[PDB]
Design a protein around this nucleic acid. Sequence first.
RNA 1: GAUGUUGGAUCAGGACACCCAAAUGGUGCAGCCGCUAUUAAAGGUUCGUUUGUUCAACGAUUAAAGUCCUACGUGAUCUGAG
RNA 2: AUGUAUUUUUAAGAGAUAGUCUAAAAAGGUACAGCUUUUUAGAAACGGAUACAACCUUGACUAGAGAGUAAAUCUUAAUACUACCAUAGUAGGCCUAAAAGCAGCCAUCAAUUGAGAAAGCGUUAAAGCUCAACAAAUUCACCAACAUAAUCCCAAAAACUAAUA
Lengths: 59, 155, 118, 38
Amino acid sequence: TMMQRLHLFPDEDIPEDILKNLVEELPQPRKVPRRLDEYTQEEIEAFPRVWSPPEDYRL
Amino acid sequence: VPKTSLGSPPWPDIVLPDPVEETRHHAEVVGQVNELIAAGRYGRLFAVVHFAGHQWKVTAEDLILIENELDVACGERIRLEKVLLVGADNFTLLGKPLLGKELVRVEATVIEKTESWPKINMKFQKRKNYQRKRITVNPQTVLRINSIEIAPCLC
Amino acid sequence: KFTRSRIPDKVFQPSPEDHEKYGGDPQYPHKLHIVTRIKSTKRRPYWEKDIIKMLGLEKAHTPQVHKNIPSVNAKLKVVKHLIRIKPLKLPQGLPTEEDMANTCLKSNGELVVRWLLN
Amino acid sequence: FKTKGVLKKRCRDCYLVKRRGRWFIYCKTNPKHKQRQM
RNA sequence: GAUGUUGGAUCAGGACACCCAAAUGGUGCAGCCGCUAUUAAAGGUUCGUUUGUUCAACGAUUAAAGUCCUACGUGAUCUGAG
RNA sequence: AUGUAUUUUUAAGAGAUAGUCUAAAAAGGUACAGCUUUUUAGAAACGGAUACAACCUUGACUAGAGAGUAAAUCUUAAUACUACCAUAGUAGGCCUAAAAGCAGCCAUCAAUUGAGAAAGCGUUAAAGCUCAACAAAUUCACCAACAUAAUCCCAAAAACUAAUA
Ligand SMILES: [Mg+2]
Ligand SMILES: [Mg+2]
Ligand SMILES: [Mg+2]
Ligand SMILES: [Mg+2]
Ligand SMILES: [Mg+2]
Ligand SMILES: [Mg+2]
Ligand SMILES: [Mg+2]
Ligand SMILES: [Mg+2]
Ligand SMILES: [Mg+2]
Ligand SMILES: [Mg+2]
Ligand SMILES: [Mg+2]
Ligand SMILES: [Mg+2]
Ligand SMILES: [Mg+2]
Ligand SMILES: [Mg+2]
Ligand SMILES: [Mg+2]
Ligand SMILES: [Zn+2]
């Protein structure tokens, strides 16, 4: 019976009916990490460059 | 110390007020609630009582069933003493771990002295030929709770 | 076979830091034991059940008081893994007649002679 | 190939590589030295 | 105060420690056969002469005529030669 | 001695005398049994080991719509090998068809700055490949692992808001 009260949707598309009757938004259990491109230039510039690379090495 | 997902302890930082401001603030708050008690603004009180080995939630006009015989004439007025909680819509008094006598008072009446309905208790054993059947009757006492009064003195 | 075993003396020679650790006084040993029974006498050999009947330890989690003389100490040693032992302390001294009704024994292992005035 | 418990290079030309989460011995000079750890 | 016991008949469920079919490594693999090893269980895996016989020999073939387990599968379905 | 209350006798009585496993000491067997044979301990929870006779926590009554605890929830892991180069007496004697470092015995010498009278393969014997020696550099390691069964896998899941819970 309680299995009947669960509604699962593959993407975000939901009938107007179910959208209209939703009370409350639950918090995400896991904290999703950022990628590399997400970081503000402020934040990247703000982070220390840990080692000093040699010049003659090709990268 | 740059920010890595570890080096920062995973929880909100703790903000704890200064003891002085807290002593002032407490003196003040207690003062105010005290003014509410003196004023008579508490609508209806409920209390948490400790009686005959249990804890109960009690309000005027209510009823409880105590599980043993007390020696009291029927109809006498008892004053319950150990009181854990007192509460009202706007405020609540909490004992550590008991509320002082002068602060609150709760008075009940004993209504009914009764013997409980028969409780059937029977032990049994597989093919040992062992049965024991015993019926239990327990003296019980019903209490009407009359009044919860709360005095102005709080400091 | 299974046996009554033994405890070699080295076990019972305390190091200097054990005084600091359990808060015993290095100069003066203490007079009375408060012995409580923590564990069951079932599944244990009969002679231990005996020792526990003599010590008066019959039911668990009730304290008992005993002398610190060697004779009692021996038996305690036999059952030492079933019991809890703590030194009895008397901050207010020894209880007299008037105080007999007012005695109380706190979990510090501490006897209070004057308990709940008025 | 051979399924073996213990791989050992048979000559100087056996090189030892990890593929598909196994250890193989590959040899270009002789194929008969090929082995695969189980 | 009974779990009726060999071999067949019928109908087969499963394992993979593949006998065939399917991809491949190695060869003392030129090719044709081979001999070994790896991965793969959807499907196959014959008809006879003699023995109660499974086993075995022998005739003839097949891409092959696997090794096993299931109360040595299966008797309130059958047969009793043993 | 000491901590406790138990023990011996006298008078009456029976059942019972076809045991199991767990730990320990041994026998026998296959240093095999849910195997058998003795000796010393334990056990036979309505709580844990999911399920459970023997393991572990506990011993016990009758009521309570109170409390504190006990044993216990099931986690642990495992990787590479790299340069560059190679003449000398002399195929040292001895044997041996040949014997040339490299079939075996003997010797282990001495040029070069540096190269074993040679550790590998190789050849009938040669021939030929590499290792050890400088020269050039850089250095980080080494103690590696193990196929499968018969109806249909066997809670679902999970890196984390603080636990002597
Ligand atoms: Mg029957
Ligand atoms: Mg079939
Ligand atoms: Mg296979
Ligand atoms: Mg098949
Ligand atoms: Mg059969
Ligand atoms: Mg049959
Ligand atoms: Mg049948
Ligand atoms: Mg028997
Ligand atoms: Mg008998
Ligand atoms: Mg077993
Ligand atoms: Mg015994
Ligand atoms: Mg259970
Ligand atoms: Mg009890
Ligand atoms: Mg030469
Ligand atoms: Mg030299
Ligand atoms: Zn090779």
